[PDB]
C-alpha cells in the first residue's frame, strides 16, 4: 500500500521517510508557556491506503507531553501536533529536541457508553463518561471502564484522546482496553479547574489489528504511543510524495 503525502514547512526538517514511518524534526527553538496549549502547524498532508488510518505522535526527552493523534481516512486538511508543558515555568525545545512521527495502521469498526463513528469511515467511537469528574490544574484524574466493548476477532480495543479536549489542556494517556477493564487517566495541564459531567464524550475507542501490538523493539516499532508494555508496530507502507495534496 502507498501513503500519499505533501510536506512544506521551512521551520521543520524531514529527517527520513523509511520502513513505513515519516519523521520530522524542529529546526528552530519551540517555546512552551506554562498552563497553555502549544500547537505546531506541520504543513503536512496525507491520505492512507484503503483499510488504514494514520497515527501522529511527538517524542522528546524534555519535560513536554504531546497528544497522540488518530488521523481519519477521509481527512484532507493540514495535520497539527498539540503539546503541553509539564512544568510550571517556560520550557523550550531547542533545535532537534522534538521528533514528530507519522505512520499507518489497519483498523476495524463495529456497528452509551459507546457511540457510532461521527462520519463515514472514521476510525474511533466516542465513549461516554460514567460519572461527573472535577479536574484541578496540573493534576491527574483516573476513571475505570469495566463493561466490555464489542468483540472483534483479530483486533484489539484501545483508548486514545480526542483533539478538542487536548486543545483545552486535557490529555488522555493512551492504553489497551484489556479483558479485565481499563483505568483511563486524564491530566489537566491548564490553569483552570475543568468539570466533565456524566455522559460527556471524554475519549475514543479504536480497534487496531493485532499485528499492530507487539513486545519487540523493531525498526517497525516504537515505545512512544501506548507506552512500554505494548509497543505500536506500524504497517509496512511506502510513502509517496504528491505535492498537489498541499493546500
Ligand atoms: O493530533 C492530532 C489529532 C487529530 N488531527 C486531525 C485529523 C483528525 O481526523 C481530525 C479530528 O481528530 P479528533 O478530534 O477526532 O481527535 O483532526 C490532527 O491534525 N492532529
Ligand atoms: O473530524 C473528523 O473526524 C474528520 O475531520 C473527518 C473527515 O472525514 O474529514
Curated annotation (Swiss-Prot):
User: Which cofactor is recorded for it?
Assistant: Mg(2+)
Q: Which InterPro entries match?
A: dUTPase-like (IPR029054), dUTPase-like_sf (IPR036157), dUTPase_trimeric (IPR033704), HSV_DUT (IPR034745)
Its GO biological process terms? dUTP metabolic process
What's its EC?
3.6.1.23
- Keywords assigned by UniProt, alphabetized: Disulfide bond, Hydrolase, Magnesium, Metal-binding, Nucleotide metabolism
Against CDD domains, the record matches this protein to: trimeric_dUTPase
| Stored Gene3D superfamilies | 2.70.40.10
Q: Does the keyword Manganese apply?
A: no
Q: Does the keyword Disulfide bond apply?
A: yes
List ligand-binding residues for substrate. 72, 80, 162-164
Which reactions appear under catalytic activity for this entry?
A: dUTP + H2O = dUMP + diphosphate + H(+)
Q: A GO molecular function for this record?
A: dUTP diphosphatase activity
- HAMAP family attached to this UniProt entry: HSV_DUT
Question: Can you state the subunit structure given in the record?
Answer: Monomer.
According to its UniProt entry, the function of this protein is described as: Involved in nucleotide metabolism: produces dUMP, the immediate precursor of thymidine nucleotides and decreases the intracellular concentration of dUTP to avoid uracil incorporation into viral DNA.
Give the family per the record.
Belongs to the dUTPase family.
Protein name as annotated: Deoxyuridine 5'-triphosphate nucleotidohydrolase
Lineage in the entry? Answer: Viruses, Duplodnaviria, Heunggongvirae, Peploviricota, Herviviricetes
Amino acid at each position: 500500500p502507498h501513503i500519499r503525502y505533501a510536506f512544506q514547512n521551512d521551520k521543520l526538517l524531514l529527517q527520513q521517510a523509511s520502513v513505513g514511518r515519516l519523521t520530522l524534526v524542529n529546526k528552530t527553538t519551540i517555546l512552551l508557556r506554562p498552563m497553555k496549549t502549544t500547537t505546531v502547524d506541520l504543513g503536512l498532508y496525507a491520505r492512507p491506503p484503503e483499510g488504514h488510518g494514520l497515527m501522529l505522535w511527538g517524542s522528546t526527552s524534555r519535560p513536554v507531553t504531546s497528544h497522540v493523534g488518530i488521523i481519519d481516512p477521509g481527512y484532507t486538511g493540514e495535520l497539527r501536533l498539540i503539546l503541553q508543558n509539564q512544568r510550571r515555568y517556560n520550557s523550550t525545545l531547542r533545535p532537534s529536541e522534538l521528533k514528530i512521527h507519522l505512520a499507518a495502521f489497519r483498523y476495524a469498526t463495529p456497528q452509551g457508553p459507546i457511540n457510532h463513528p461521527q462520519y463515514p469511515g472514521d476510525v474511533g467511537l466516542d465513549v461516554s463518561l460514567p460519572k461527573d469528574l472535577a479536574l484541578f490544574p496540573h493534576q491527574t484524574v483516573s476513571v475505570t471502564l469495566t463493561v466490555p466493548p464489542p468483540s472483534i476477532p483479530h483486533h484489539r480495543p484501545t483508548i486514545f484522546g480526542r483533539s478538542g479536549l487536548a486543545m483545552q489542556g486535557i490529555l488522555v494517556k493512551p492504553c489497551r482496553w484489556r479483558r479485565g477493564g481499563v483505568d483511563v487517566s486524564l491530566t489537566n495541564f491548564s490553569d483552570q479547574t475543568v468539570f466533565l459531567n456524566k455522559y460527556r464524550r471524554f475519549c475514543q475507542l479504536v480497534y487496531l489489528h493485532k499485528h499492530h501490538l507487539t513486545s519487540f523493539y523493531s525498526p517497525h516499532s516504537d515505545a512512544g504511543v501506548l507506552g512500554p508494555r505494548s509497543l505500536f508496530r506500524w504497517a509496512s507502507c511506502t510513502f509517496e510524495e504528491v505535492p498537489s495534496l498541499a493546500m
